[PDB]
Structures are given as C-alpha cells and as structure tokens.
Amino acid sequence: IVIERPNVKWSDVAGLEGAKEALKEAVILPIKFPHLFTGKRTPWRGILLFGPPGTGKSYLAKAVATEANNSTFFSISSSSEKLVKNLFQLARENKPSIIFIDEIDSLCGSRSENESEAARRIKTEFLVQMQGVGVDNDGILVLGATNIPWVLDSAIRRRFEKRIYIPLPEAHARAAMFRLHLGSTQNSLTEADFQELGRKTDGYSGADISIIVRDALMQPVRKVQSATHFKKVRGPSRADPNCIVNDLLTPCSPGDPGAIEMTWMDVPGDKLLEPVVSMWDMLRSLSSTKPTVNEQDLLKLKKFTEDFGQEG
Ligand SMILES: Nc1ncnc2c1ncn2[C@@H]1O[C@H](COP(=O)(O)OP(=O)(O)O)[C@@H](O)[C@H]1O
Secondary structure, three states, X not given: OOOOOOOOOHHHOOOOHHHHHHHHHHHHHHHHOHHHHOHHHOOOOEEXXXXXXXXXXXXXXXXXXXXXXXXXXXXXXXXXXXXXXXXXXXXXXXXXXXXXXXXXXXXXXXXXXXXXXXXXXXXXXXXXXXXXXXXXXXXXXXXXXXXXXXXXXXXXXXXXXXXXXXXXXXXXXXXXXXXXXXXXXXXXXXXXXHHHHHHHOOOOXXXXXXXXXHHHOOHHHHHHHOOOEEEOOOOXXXXXXXXXXXXXXXEOOOOOOOOEEOOOOOOOHHHEOOOOEOHHHHHHHHHOOOOOOOHHHHHHHHHHHHHHOOOO
C-alpha cells in the first residue's frame, strides 16, 4: 500500500558491503546510466533478498528506496484482491519505478500444504504480471524479501533471476549497529565499548540488537519516572543549550549528598536533566535478551542456497 520514499542512507545500513554493491549495480546504475544497461545488459527483472530473519532484508529495502533517485518506490506486504493489477499500473505510469514486496513467502504454503481457494487466484494474478502482454520493459524492478525462501513456489521463485543472501552481521557490523541505533542521544559509551558490545553479541541478528538498544535507550526514562530523590546539578539551559545553569534537577539515590525529597511530579518541565545511557545499561539490556536465530535457520536455509542456486 505505502507509496512513499524514506530516509535510510546506505551509511545507516551496517555491514552488507556486497548486498550494497550488488543492489547498486542492479538498481541504481541502470537508473542513472540507462545507455549502459541496454541490449544484452538489460538489468534483471526481480531480485530476491533472502536469509535469516532480522538480518536486514526489509531495512536494506528502504535503503534502495532512498538511494532511488526520485525513482518512485512502492512497498506492499502480507495483508477482490485485484489490487495487484492496480499496483503495477501506477508503477508503469511513473517509470522508472521499484516494487518491494516484503515477506513474499506470504503467498505460498509448501510445508504442511497451507491451501486457500482464492489465494491460488491471488498468486497467479501477479505470477502473470511478471511478463505482461503490454511489456513492462519499463525501468521497473521487483524486490522480494523472505526469511523462509524454501517454502516458495518455483512459479514465483523462478521469476527472480538474481537472488541475494543477507547474512547475520559480523563483529564490526554489530558494533556499528549499536552506535547507529544509539543515534545522537545523550550517552557515555566509548569506542572501546561499542567494540566490546560487538564482541558480546556474537550470533545476534540486527533486529535483536535494535531491540536491545531501544531498551537500554529507555533506561534514563525509567530512572526519571521511578525516582524518589533528585539532586540539583548544573548543566545546559533547556531553552538555550549554550548557557549553563547550576539549576537542573537529575534523579539520584536517596543516599546521595544533595538529594532532595520529591518525584518527577514536582520537577519543572524545563529543569529536568536526564541521565546519559551508559555501558552498564546496554549490558544489562543485553543480558535479558538472547539470540533467536539458531542453526536450523541456516540449516534449512543452507539447503535452498545449494539446491536452487540462481535462476531463482
Ligand atoms: N544490517 C542492519 N543494519 C542496521 N539495522 C538493522 C540491520 N539489520 C536489521 N536492522 C534492524 O532491524 C530492523 C529491520 O529488520 P528487517 O526489517 O532488516 O528484518 P527482516 O530483515 O525483515 O527480519 C530495523 O529497524 C533495524 O533497526
């Protein structure tokens, strides 16, 4: 449904050097330098991003969605469904355009034979759109995401000539994801800290880490809400940062010199000085969270890789 353009720069996507290049070569260059991809170099029709969950598929998708030079981006997902015909339409009308279908593994059921009457109808609607009588020769590419690609139907799988794997982040990659998600928020983690976190999250996916930071990140909020005492520290003016004040209030332990008796209720709106997210927090946040992506994922996944190679 969403017909937007996001703001996820390659920089934000950590790791995935090759995915990045592979996607530049098949999506961005053909757009910028059309004369280069004519004749025998017509870019592939559909790319299929696949691999363990939370490794970057959807995310990376938005990356190309931003790096698409005004080349309108269309995104749909698992959700009278002739609206498929309708999607490709506005797409051809606005070429060059991209189509991203998250978790394409939706329309299928190649395990326990999950079968529906008209879902067999929904598939073929699009399964036909791939060629089109009125050739969509246009600069239109179809992106497909999936964490369970083997359950895919050869019918669709084989309309994606170029397929890309999206792996579990390596060390350096993790570290950056910690710094990235932390964003520009007040904290106190040193480089050596990120690297140490990177080393600790061995085997975690990118979504796992994001789930971690989003938690630790909320640590200074809890401390402020659940506090019982507040010191009276000195720090930047809430209304004008470059003007220190010796007036701000910050939550602190009852057993601390300068500890006033009162909760956030009393703390004025513009005198609150929040704590900085710390390494002790991220670690506590890391502990109560364990990697989900087990070897089966890569196991039944390694299969698809070998037994299907390209041409799907
Ligand atoms: N390689 C990555 N770089 C930065 N963030 C990532 C990466 N992979 C996953 N994430 C995080 O997880 C989310 C995207 O998950 P995707 O949508 O990548 O999961 P799927 O890959 O869809 O399971 C984003 O919100 C992002 O914060």
